[PDB]
Amino acid sequence: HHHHHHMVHITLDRNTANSWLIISKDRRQVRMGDTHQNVSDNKERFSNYPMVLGAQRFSSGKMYWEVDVTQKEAWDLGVCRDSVQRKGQFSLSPENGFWTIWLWQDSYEAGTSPQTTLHIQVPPCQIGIFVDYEAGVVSFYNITDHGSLIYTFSECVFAGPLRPFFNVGFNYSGGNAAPLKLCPL
Numbered sequence: 001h002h003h004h005h006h007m008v009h010i011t012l013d014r015n016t017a018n019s020w021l022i023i024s025k026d027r028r029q030v031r032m033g034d035t036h037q038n039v040s041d042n043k044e045r046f047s048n049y050p051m052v053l054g055a056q057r058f059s060s061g062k063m064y065w066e067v068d069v070t071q072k073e074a075w076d077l078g079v080c081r082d083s084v085q086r087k088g089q090f091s092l093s094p095e096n097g098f099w100t101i102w103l104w105q106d107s108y109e110a111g112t113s114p115q116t117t118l119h120i121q122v123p124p125c126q127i128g129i130f131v132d133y134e135a136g137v138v139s140f141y142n143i144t145d146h147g148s149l150i151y152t153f154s155e156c157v158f159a160g161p162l163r164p165f166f167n168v169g170f171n172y173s174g175g176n177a178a179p180l181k182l183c184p185l
């Protein structure tokens, strides 16, 4: 692709994080902690899942960023409305305000309703995410495979400001402790 020039510097918003997440000092990395991380509760925190938002809000334009997923077994990545549900159980779908892909149990899927199988020959170590607000597009790229397209959501109905969205996944297996990292420009 040729979207690299729309690169934006994303940082994570501590206040939105599930209470078990550990965000690095530079706000560029997140991982699952062993326990509650000793923060107060608030209405912004995702309660049921190991999720966190970027601080940046987008309402126009073209935006691109990259995320490192090296050695993880499970994660969700994409964008979401600023007003997504934070508490209780919910599915990742455009109806609920999410435009995401994920890895789970050795397969990749797009967060449509129902979910869509992805065809990836080279397991990615870094994912590129492109948002065109005006066009209603969210696209995902395999940086490990020379930028090959993974998935395009088109005809998106954002219906609000967008925020970068992250889920580090649970670590029941002991194989999913590695962080998500925002990669440098």
Ligand SMILES: COC1CN(S(=O)(=O)N2CCCC2)C1
Pocket (backbone or CB within 6 Å): 032, 033, 034, 035, 170, 171, 172, 173, 176, 177
């Ligand atoms: C980073 O590794 C730690 C192992 N655990 S956990 O994922 O099994 N789990 C999630 C909530 C209860 C314990 C996090």
